[PDB]
From a paper:
The second principal receptor for IgE, [name], is a type II transmembrane glycoprotein with a C-type lectin-like domain (CTLD)4 (3, 4). In its membrane-bound form, [name] consists of three CTLD “heads” connected to the membrane via a trimeric α-helical coiled-coil “stalk”. The interaction between [name] and IgE is critical in the regulation of IgE synthesis, which can be up- or down-regulated depending on the oligomerization state of [name] (2, 9, 10). We have determined the crystal structures of the human lectin-like head domain of [name] in its [name]+-free and [name]+-bound forms, as well as the crystal structure of the [name]+-bound head domain of [name] in complex with a subfragment of IgE-Fc consisting of the dimer of Cϵ3 and Cϵ4 domains (Fcϵ3-4).
The [name]+-free and [name]+-soaked derCD23 crystals both belong to space group P1 and have four molecules within the asymmetric unit. Comparison of the [name]+-free and [name]+-bound derCD23 structures reveals that the only conformational differences are in loop 4 and, to a lesser degree, in loop 1. Although the four copies of loop 4 in the [name]+-bound structure adopt similar conformations, two copies of this loop in the [name]+-free structure adopt a different conformation, and the other two adopt yet another. These two different conformations of [name]+-free derCD23 are not the result of different crystal packing interactions. In [name]+-free “conformation 1,” two principal binding site residues (Glu-249 and Asp-270) are in a similar position to that observed in the [name]+-bound structure, although the orientation of the Thr-251 side chain is different. In [name]+-free “conformation 2,” only Glu-249 remains in a similar position when compared with the [name]+-bound structure, although marked differences are seen for both Thr-251 and Asp-270. In the [name]+-free structure, this distance is 6.1 Å in conformation 1 and 8.3 Å in conformation 2; Pro-250 is cis in the former and trans in the latter. The trans configuration of Pro-250 forms two hydrogen bonds with Arg-253, whereas cis Pro-250 cannot; consequently, both Arg-253 and Ser-254 are disordered when Pro-250 is cis (conformation 1), but are ordered, with Arg-253 pointing into a cavity between loops 1 and 4, when Pro-250 is trans (conformation 2). Thus, trans is apparently favored in the absence of [name]+ or other factors.
Author numbering: 157 to 291
Write the structure that this text describes.
């Protein structure tokens, strides 16, 4: 169970995860289901090296990621339930005064903006666990 770097076709490995860079115009919840129906989830990001890997492959015109303010009251959490131990917010984000802007996108710089969930974006990123080579 020693080496975890195998992904399915069309996915890209980085560390112990596989990532799928989707293209196609979708609102946040729609991208959420595209990822689930391929057996991953909208991406969660947990380190600067993971962020750097995403920034190099990310779409220039913005991508949905798996961060959402779930519950009115300003606390953004990952769809996969993993915890928030890393953040790459654009300066000033997320703001208190933006009622309704509960979903998160990653810009071409890789920095994160909150967004209305019904915004349509051209790209979205899924992740899943890499499987491991038997030695």
């Amino acid at each position: 169970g020693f080496v975890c770097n195998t992904c399915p076709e069309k996915w890209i490995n980085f560390q112990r995860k596989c990532y799928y860079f989707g293209k196609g115009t979708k609102q946040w919840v729609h991208a959420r289901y595209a990822c689930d129906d391929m057996e991953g989830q909208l991406v969660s990001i947990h380190s600067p090296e993971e962020q750097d890997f995403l920034t190099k492959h990310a779409s220039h015109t913005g991508s949905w990621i798996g961060l959402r303010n779930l519950d009115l009251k300003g606390e953004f959490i990952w769809v996969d339930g993993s915890h928030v131990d890393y953040s790459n917010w654009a300066p000033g984000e997320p703001t208190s005064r933006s009622q309704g802007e509960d979903c998160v996108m990653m810009r071409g710089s890789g920095r994160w903006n909150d967004a209305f969930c019904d915004r349509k974006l051209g790209a979205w990123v899924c992740d899943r666990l890499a499987t491991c080579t038997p030695p």
